Amino acid sequence: MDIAIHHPWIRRPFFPFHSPSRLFDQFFGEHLLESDLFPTSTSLSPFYLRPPSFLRAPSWFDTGLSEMRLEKDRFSVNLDVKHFSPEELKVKVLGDVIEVHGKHEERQDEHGFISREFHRKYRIPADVDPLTITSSLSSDGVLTVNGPRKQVSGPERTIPITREEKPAVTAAPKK
Amino acid sequence: MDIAIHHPWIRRPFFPFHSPSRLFDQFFGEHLLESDLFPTSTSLSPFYLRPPSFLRAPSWFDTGLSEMRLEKDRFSVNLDVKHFSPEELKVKVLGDVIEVHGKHEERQDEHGFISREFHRKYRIPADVDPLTITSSLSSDGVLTVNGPRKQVSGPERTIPITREEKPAVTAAPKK
Amino acid sequence: MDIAIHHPWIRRPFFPFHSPSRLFDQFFGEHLLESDLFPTSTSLSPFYLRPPSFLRAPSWFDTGLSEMRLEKDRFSVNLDVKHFSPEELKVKVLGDVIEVHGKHEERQDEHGFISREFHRKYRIPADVDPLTITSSLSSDGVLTVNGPRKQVSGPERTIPITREEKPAVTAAPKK
Amino acid sequence: MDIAIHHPWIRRPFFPFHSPSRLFDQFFGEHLLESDLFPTSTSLSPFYLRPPSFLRAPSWFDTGLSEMRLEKDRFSVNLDVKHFSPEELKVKVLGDVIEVHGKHEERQDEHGFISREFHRKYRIPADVDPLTITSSLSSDGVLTVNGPRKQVSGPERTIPITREEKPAVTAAPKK
Amino acid sequence: MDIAIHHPWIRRPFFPFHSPSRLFDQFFGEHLLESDLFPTSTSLSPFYLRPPSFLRAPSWFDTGLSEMRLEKDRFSVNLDVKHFSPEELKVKVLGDVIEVHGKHEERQDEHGFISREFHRKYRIPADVDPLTITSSLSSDGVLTVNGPRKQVSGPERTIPITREEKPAVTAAPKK
Amino acid sequence: MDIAIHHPWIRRPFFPFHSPSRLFDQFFGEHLLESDLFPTSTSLSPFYLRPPSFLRAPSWFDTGLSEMRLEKDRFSVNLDVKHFSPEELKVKVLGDVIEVHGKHEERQDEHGFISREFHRKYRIPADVDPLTITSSLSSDGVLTVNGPRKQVSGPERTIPITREEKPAVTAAPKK
Amino acid sequence: MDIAIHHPWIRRPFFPFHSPSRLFDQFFGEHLLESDLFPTSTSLSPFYLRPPSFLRAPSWFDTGLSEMRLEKDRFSVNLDVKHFSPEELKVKVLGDVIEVHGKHEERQDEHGFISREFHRKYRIPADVDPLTITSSLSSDGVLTVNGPRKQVSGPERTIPITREEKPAVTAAPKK
Amino acid sequence: MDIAIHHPWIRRPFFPFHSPSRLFDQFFGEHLLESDLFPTSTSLSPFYLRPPSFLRAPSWFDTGLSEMRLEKDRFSVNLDVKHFSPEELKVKVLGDVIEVHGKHEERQDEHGFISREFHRKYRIPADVDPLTITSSLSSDGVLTVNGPRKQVSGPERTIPITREEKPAVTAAPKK
Amino acid sequence: MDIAIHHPWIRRPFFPFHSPSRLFDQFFGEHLLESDLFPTSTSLSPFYLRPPSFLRAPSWFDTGLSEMRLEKDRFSVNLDVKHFSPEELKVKVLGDVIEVHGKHEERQDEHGFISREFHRKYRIPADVDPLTITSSLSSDGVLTVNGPRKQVSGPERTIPITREEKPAVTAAPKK
């Protein structure tokens, strides 16, 4: 844990290409995402949906897919955060449950400040696997949890214990 | 660390592997990020990363498989509670994780009472489904979770947030 | 900050404000502390700190006013909850601070449920009195905290305790 | 947050007048308070009260005032802590509520130590404004929260929600 | 609290004999314990018990003693932790109550790990005095709280308050 | 701490004590650890340690006694609560520690209510025994804990764990 | 500078822009130098430099325009010389820069003569053309430069000379 | 001397005294030097230095009475010479200091002679007066200085020299 | 190796191994040097060194045995020379070390001749005796060293010369 040795020694080899931001693996990753999802060089390959939005000029489409084949396949789910909240949002991958918690103050009044909040609750063990599902985000709050998938889905438990039914028992007369 | 020994020596059995692009972590990282966006005419991969190999005939791809499932069928798992502890045991089915917490005082002394406890931690996704998996306790403590299976799980913490096209910051000279 | 530039430069326009007593923070601080004890034949003032001004005709005094009250009358006020959340909303009147916490799930997906939330933070002491301010809810979510008004508030953290006549300490050489 | 640069650089200019205690702004303030409240140079200006005390030689008077005029006036409330507890007391200005919590062990027995505690609860929004009310303790525990004032006073809330009375209702026959 | 001065200055005089374990005051104390409790050079004199164990070759004997004379008495109680748990063990001397909490995973399965736990609860104020009782753990988790002793033993409280019985009483007619 | 003065001076009135074995803390520490195992042929010892003394005729031993009990009898200790607080008082008998927590508001102001509190902390082992020791409250606040006694207590934190027979570690050259 | 704050913070709202090529100043600099040689198949470009933008639909190019021309028409600009100075004024038409230098002594004292001066600096290329633009003076000092227009100018100092294919230098070790 | 502890802590029980003029040693030193020149309408004082006190009713002044005389009357002081030494004793009356030097050999050995000596140092000004104070010797060694008294003395070394109006020195740059 | 982690962690699993005498290498070294002089009353040892063990019943001693002989019989070892090299092979019996050096050119190219070489290094003391062990070559290269055996060998370099008796040296201060 050489904080005064390794830390300044690991940030050194980064200098030859260090200066822009602290996060270099998402703008170039999403820039390629919006460019790879578009028929470049080759041509054709779509599939989407469309939920309610406040936008009049543009439109917010809830991205989604589905597939299965040989022995390998990718997938990507998109959370909902119409308004960006980079610092005011926290993504949590609690097992087979993906949830987003973003709150941003976009509406302002005299002495009162309004703060909207978007919270999604996804329980898709068939599309999620914490040991592989990561999380992406857009400048418009568009969260995108990419990664493989599996199966199964259910919260219920059902676990009875004891009950006996072996020693002490009851009964009644008969004939 | 003998910089005058370990450095030239640790760089000895490295030559036949050398010349792997000084920026191998980023070069291949981009190609893997491109195939992580849209199914790039591959044999459909969840995260199969094409790595540098000496294999000339076949094409190797970094994969998991042996980290999700292995040897399961269609039975019931049995927890361990050597000594009976009906009232003093609590079985919890938290997702694909089956656990048992049973504590019973079997050893006694003058003014000191000994209490033994058995705690099992089962992270069997392809063997447990919280929705159907139930529990059956015996009079000796033998706990048995019965039910079907088939699914993958595994709690990880790999969710890089922020970084989402359109930011921009600035600075200025100082002293 | 080039000490050989910013120092002599930042000390240039300062000329017409220079000669303000090397110990201005303590000199005036004592005079302000003297008038903060007993109404010293002044035009009465909570904290009218007589500062050094260039105004020859009038005498300026540091004050607040524009940081407590402004434009109010009788009012009724109105919180914001675009979408109805009767059972899923909690209005809290914590002193001169009116807040609303309403969360309703209006957007739904396959296995993911979206939940929007509206949270208003009103720091209106001039139009809020917890003793007489009530709350009325509409079927659309429109909240209305009607009632009288007139008051001032504002949570700060300026309470320098300790030091209170007759203490005494000491020390001695060391090495 | 240059703790190893700014901290030792800001305490440097304090050296020319350093060495005494570490709360220079409270003894000189109270010393002037007990000297300004006394007709010095000029003459006359009183107003006080008197609660029960254990002191036989001296007397503990609960200080208090009241006034209103143009649009600016000062004020000062005094908490109660007969026995000093500089380190064992905490003053809290929770909005329009001033409370003092001081506990000092003045009575001692064989193997039992007695500890008295003084706790005041002030709900004076008319004499308190957290955004300007400070605190000044005495060597005898005499706490004094000085600062401006305003108006209003009340804890009750009264905020009914829903009730409906619009759609589904009830009635009875008639003629 | 000179962490960057005293710390490296106190570990300096230890170097002349520093290199082995981080603890040098227990192996020698237990090695001498198992050697002093054995008739060496002189004659002999024992006293013990024997509880249920899983060991077939050896045997776990619950050590214990008892004595009283003049005004001096040695004593040592032994907690129970059959399997070693150096790191996974926490001894607590909460007053006249000695408790041990050790949990170690000795049984392993496919994807399920078993973890046994030994917890003793001693309420011996007659053999314990936190102001003198210490602890000594043995390789086989054999904990041994050595130290003097005193008397008394009991948890019950029984502290009735008020009841009145003086003012405001009840009665009934008579003749 | 003039090293050229305090060092030779602090070692001056120490000569007649010098030559106490450079490793006195370990030398005697071993002999005291040997007599702490088995009741070695002596007048027993709760923790009597043979220290280096100038006494030629008698043999001195490090003892306690005066740190456990002193002057007690049948007794019936009394707590202190100057002002009655029947409903506002809580007597707690936590082991050999008797405490009283009574708070009553006897002083009142305009909008500020004063509340006095009496808290006693009695650590009398030779006077308290949780079982029998009860409590009796008066109408003036005079609390009285009556009952027998005889026992010693004292919550300390001296329990060195680990160093439990046969461990072993290892290392290697580095830089 | 707070390298432990400003550095990671100034890189925060920079992620969505990150990955702009560690050598962005040279990468794009080469592409801009290529299009600056021969009129590459484009809508031409005085110096339009294709920059990295988030605009997906349109293609943005860095340009000037609003730094040469703006709002002009058949004009006859007029300089300012409030007080007449026929013999004491000099109008200079240095290219697309019209200037006036008039100094007249209107204020007089005992032995001190005051002299006011009006100096205008007009850099209007789209309004001036030294060849045609003339000047007309009034009796009050109102100077008026009449004539056509249409032109662009602006004195800059960006002219790299050195470097021109076929150089070569050398050196050698030293100490 | 933890500067990060002793400094802020030692500056704690000094607050109530704090703000006593950063130049207290010179400020009051001047006022004491002014009253040391001419009897400034005071109650006359050799060195009554008016110090800063918390006493509000009375005015305190630095005295010295308890450092000159105390419990004397009109008798004769007796020196100590347990063993007679008429010819081997020398009494000296050096001002207000009475001393006795008597040495007699009372213990004898083989070839070694022991000599005991009694030396008294009396600095009693209010009991001695070189003029009248005489000395009477007894046959047992009991010395007795008889005579009146009343006087004050005490050898000190506080006589600053030089610094007498009209000096002047000078210097110049160097390197 | 983080001295703030590895140091306290590499001494942790050393816990009950400590107290092995800070000078263990010299303490036991002396006892081993004493038993290396005269055959001290023991079961005779070549170099058995009584080490510190946890074994209570048996006494362990550092020994060799498994570093001299193992599994042998009459035997007639045979070297390996896949391809015959009668004239191009040299068998050397240097003590208890049998070696073979045969080189034969079996592969031929245009102007390049390949030469294979087989070299065996046998350090079998319990199988070789230079005096009797002979060598027999076959026509295929199969070398066979036949003969009896029984012996121990092994070239080492442990001969610390010097350190005789009565030398005497000296030095003196310098600078």
Swiss-Prot record, chains A, B, C, D, E, F, G, H, I:
N6-acetyllysine PTM sites in chain numbering: K92, K166
A cellular-component GO term for this protein: perikaryon
A molecular function (GO) term: structural constituent of eye lens
UniProt domain sHSP: residue ranges: 56-164
Compartment annotation: Cytoplasm; Nucleus; Secreted; Lysosome
Site residues by UniProt (Susceptible to oxidation): Y48, W60, M68
Phosphoserine found at: S19, S45, S59
Tissue: Lens as well as other tissues. Expressed in myocardial tissue.
Keyword Magnesium: no
Keyword vocabulary terms for this entry: Acetylation, Cardiomyopathy, Cataract, Chaperone, Cytoplasm, Disease variant, Eye lens protein, Glycoprotein, Lysosome, Metal-binding, Myofibrillar myopathy, Nucleus, Oxidation, Phosphoprotein, Secreted, Zinc
Segments traversing the membrane: none
Sites where the protein binds Zn(2+) 2: H104, E106
Reported function: May contribute to the transparency and refractive index of the lens. Has chaperone-like activity, preventing aggregation of various proteins under a wide range of stress conditions. In lens epithelial cells, stabilizes the ATP6V1A protein, preventing its degradation by the proteasome.
Linked pathology: Myopathy, myofibrillar, 2: A form of myofibrillar myopathy, a group of chronic neuromuscular disorders characterized at ultrastructural level by disintegration of the sarcomeric Z disk and myofibrils, and replacement of the normal myofibrillar markings by small dense granules, or larger hyaline masses, or amorphous material. MFM2 is characterized by weakness of the proximal and distal limb muscles, weakness of the neck, velopharynx and trunk muscles, hypertrophic cardiomyopathy, and cataract in a subset of patients. Cataract 16, multiple types: An opacification of the crystalline lens of the eye that frequently results in visual impairment or blindness. Opacities vary in morphology, are often confined to a portion of the lens, and may be static or progressive. In general, the more posteriorly located and dense an opacity, the greater the impact on visual function. CTRCT16 includes posterior polar cataract, among others. Posterior polar cataract is a subcapsular opacity, usually disk-shaped, located at the back of the lens.
UniProt-recorded name of the protein: Alpha-crystallin B chain
Organism this protein belongs to: Homo sapiens
Lineage: Eukaryota, Metazoa, Chordata, Craniata, Vertebrata
